[PDB]
Ligand binder design. Structure first.
Ligand SMILES: CC(=O)N[C@H]1[C@H](O[C@H]2[C@H](O)[C@H](O)[C@@H](O[C@@H]3[C@H](O)[C@H](O)O[C@H](CO)[C@H]3O)O[C@@H]2CO)O[C@H](CO)[C@@H](O)[C@@H]1O
Ligand SMILES: NCCCCCCOP(=O)(O)OP(=O)(O)OC[C@H]1O[C@@H](n2ccc(=O)[nH]c2=O)[C@H](O)[C@@H]1O
Ligand SMILES: [Mn+2]
Length: 273
């Protein structure tokens, strides 16, 4: 009986003030967001959203950043009238980090909860400054964090696709998901850009003002050192994407926690093979 939500949300306020100098209390955030259900799930009560979005955050030892992320994003996602869920994919252990593999885990596991048809992949330390920057999918892969303060409010290079992006379920499946072998920092986002291009797609982006994004300044994490093989790997994406991705993925979930503001999947994704 509920009608469809309007194509563009009438609730948006646009430019917002973002700051990271204050403490955040998630119990309070939960109180400020009474309509967000257990596990960090929300859908509008007055209309049906065509956007069924699973937001996937690759993660390890970034609780402080995550608190700010939840504090700022939950209000924004609800104003965008999305039927969404938050998933923090926590890498078990203390061996070399694997951002893209965790993102694949997020895609596969979120699908076990609900019929999501859109996936937003977001680093934990990126906060949008304008709610007109849609956290949902488009006819083409969508690059969301286009004008980050750390890059001088512009793209670092025109083919940059890192930070925050959204791929529909079909777009993601079409590229066999993300690569599983980019251990350590760098290149996996360039590999993903290549995958999309090699499958006939092009990147969709909001304008630079609407796409303004803040990065929470932080120091280098241990166990995610720049991958020396990254330059060689992105040069062979066309060939490697055929057999490295969703169709070559295995992992072992160790724990699933449903917190009020998000679902945390702690997973063992192993080490290089
Ligand atoms: C493959 C890779 O590392 N991609 C990351 C991307 O890398 C940029 C880098 O930020 C900068 O734009 C430039 O850096 C040169 C590169 O490291 C080369 O090998 O050595 C010279 C020595 O002077 C560097 O200046 O080009 C890289 C390749 O496009 O940066 C983005 C944003 O941080 C990462 O998301 C991406 O993974
Ligand atoms: N001068 C200090 C510059 C710090 C350089 C470190 C590289 O920074 P960035 O390119 O922002 O990458 P990053 O934030 O370390 O990694 C991207 C994303 O991986 C996740 N991530 C990475 C490493 C880690 O230990 N834990 C974690 O959760 C997190 O969602 C993060 O936002
Ligand atoms: Mn960062």
């Amino acid at each position: 009986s509920l009608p469809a939500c309007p194509e563009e949300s009438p609730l948006l306020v646009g430019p917002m003030l973002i700051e990271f100098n204050m403490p955040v209390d998630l119990e309070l955030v939960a109180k400020q967001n009474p309509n967000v259900k257990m596990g960090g799930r929300y859908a509008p009560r007055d209309c049906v959203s065509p956007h069924k979005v699973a937001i996937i955050i690759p993660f390890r030892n970034r609780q402080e950043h995550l608190k700010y992320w939840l504090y700022y994003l939950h209000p924004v996602l609800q104003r965008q009238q999305l039927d969404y869920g938050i998933y923090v994919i926590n890498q078990a252990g203390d061996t070399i980090f694997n951002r893209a593999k965790l993102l694949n885990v997020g895609f596969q596991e979120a699908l076990k909860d609900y019929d999501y048809t859109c996936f937003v992949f977001s680093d934990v330390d990126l906060i949008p400054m304008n709610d007109h920057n849609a956290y949902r999918c488009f006819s083409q892969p969508r690059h969301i964090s286009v004008a980050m303060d750390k890059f001088g409010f512009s793209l670092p290079y025109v083919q940059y696709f890192g930070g925050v992006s959204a791929l529909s379920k079909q777009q993601f499946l079409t590229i066999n998901g993300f690569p599983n072998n980019y251990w350590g920092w760098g290149g996996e986002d360039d590999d993903i850009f290549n995958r999309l291009v090699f499958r006939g797609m092009s990147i969709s982006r909001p304008n630079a003002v609407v796409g303004t994004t803040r990065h929470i300044r932080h120091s280098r994490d241990k166990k995610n050192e720049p991958n020396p093989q990254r330059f060689d790997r992105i040069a062979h994406t066309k060939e490697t994407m055929l057999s490295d991705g969703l169709n070559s993925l295995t992992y072992q979930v160790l724990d699933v926690q449903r917190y009020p503001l998000y679902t945390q999947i702690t997973v063992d994704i192993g080490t290089p093979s």
